[model samples]
Target: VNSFSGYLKLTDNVYIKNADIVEEAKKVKPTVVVNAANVYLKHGGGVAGALNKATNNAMQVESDDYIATNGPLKVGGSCVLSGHNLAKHCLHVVGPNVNKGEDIQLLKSAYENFNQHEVLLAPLLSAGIFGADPIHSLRVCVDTVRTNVYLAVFDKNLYDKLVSSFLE
Candidate 1:
């Protein structure tokens, strides 16, 4: 296993198809693996179990072991909900494709986890079906995580908006 201090950076708009997510994880070998892919929800099974099986080796942290999954509802006619276990943190937001409120709730819950000092590495909130207007989705995420311990936003576009909005 590889160990490093501080935080790692991942470039934006890097699309890793479902078949390649595991291969990418192997290449990066991150201690904490977060699955921000919007398409995972449309997988053969649900997101959590399937992802857990695929990238099990990439995320090896004991306390927060395993991979994390997130997406909105009805992308594929399913309501995705967040689930946390000994292995990974799985968050399923209600897809704007079908619903909206639950997506907000999912963000709130994810922020709550970060607020409590949990090591969280989530993707941009706008990456979901709500991608059309990332500003709104980002606003909710920043507002919720503003007072938290330490949180990182992977997408630069979303990060810039977060910085601008936080100052306002």
Candidate 2:
């Protein structure tokens, strides 16, 4: 992992890592693996889908039960569940949708809401289908989270950009 400790004023170290979140989760054995969740908490696509696939869809079953009991999650809110195959637990965070005019605070809240943990594995939340700029999402993650983190990136260019951002 490439460290970003030199640039950001993080509560703990943050690393820019590869996007194979499941593979990295296994390698790191973090306390929790984060999910860029939809408000419905459905693990249908994106990072959530990959996690569900890794768990043989057991994660979906767990999420279904949560939503069944508590209803859809609000944006910028979160819930935790057994990680199944990923980590000891999975933190599901409903990130901001920029198209909706949600602000950075909401995105920061998503990063801030994670359960206490020594290590956290997370994607570039809202930077995918949710439409937040990748650099902006990285800034929020770096600024808000207090635990050691692995910021997963799927695209090489995005990874390069995140890495270079730290150099500035």
Candidate 3:
């Protein structure tokens, strides 16, 4: 596992993402892994899918139960479940599925931050799977909390581009 491609500070809280999310997961050993899921936690695409695969189907087993009770989660809301593999927990947020002009800011409101400085593996929420702007989504992720955040960006070229485009 390598360090992130780059780092940015959203105030005192830091923001990060590397080319390899899967590899980054191992390094961070985060307490919670954030999943950008639909209401049912069933996008089966992008970072969420990658995390589920990483966890050895632990996400499915636990997330299914949450959906079973809640039916469909609301926009800008989140549900928590146990995690396997690397992280101890998974925070599934209803962030994608933009039909109308969705708020890129909704992610800021999607879930509560880990007040405890617990390491959090934050998948680049709307940036992947949902196809939102990379820089904009990164901003939302950074704006969300002050916890030690280990964000994942799967594409190295994209990460490079965003780093140059936005960070420069």
Candidate 4:
């Protein structure tokens, strides 16, 4: 629980966390982890970058296959990947494309309804290194949880937003 620091809970099983997803994945091996990826699965940055490298680049290989199979998945689309190392099954979701695909409902719907794995790990989608407002991203994630979720947060802004909303 290092770096977890007693995060805020917005749901029964979903809570805000402050540790690196990679380290947590290491602690919870074969856990259901996530990497917000594009259809490209390029591993360019953010959660995807870390997960890709941790999977020894096998992620992108699977990504190539995923895209080759007739797709550049839409924002709400989610794919599953399997492997050793830090994770067993990867819930790869297509997050905001920085433009027309910023549908909060779909993203929330995807997370709220997804219950494939017990401990799904992920970082804030499209925020931070992905060019999104940390506050809104956190809100969307919190408001849309129907299953157990382990989310990564790296800023006071996100925490502040959660506290404000949770109190109000």
Best by TM-score: 2
Candidate 3 CA-lDDT value: 0.66
lDDT of 3 by residue, 132-166 (tens): 77777666765566667765667778767766754
- Ordered list by lDDT, greatest first: 2, 4, 3, 1
Candidate 4 displacement at residue 1 in angstroms: 14
Segments of candidate 4 deviating more than 4 angstroms = 1-8, 99-105, 155-168
Residue-by-residue lDDT tens digits, candidate 2, 8-81 = 33235677764578777776676788899988888778888888999999999988888898999988898888
Question: lDDT of each prediction vs. the true structure?
Answer: 0.36, 0.78, 0.66, 0.68
Worst 10 residues of 2 by lDDT: 1-10
- Whole-model lDDT for model 2 versus the true structure? 0.78
> What is the clash count of model 1?
4
Q: What is candidate 1's lDDT per residue for 1-168, written digit by digit as tens?
A: 212223322212111111232333344343334433233343333333344456442222321321233323333222223322312343433233213433444544443433432333334443444443555545555556533222234346655565555445
* Candidate 3: RMSD to truth: 3.3
TM match of model 1 to true structure:
0.38
lDDT of 3 at 110: 64
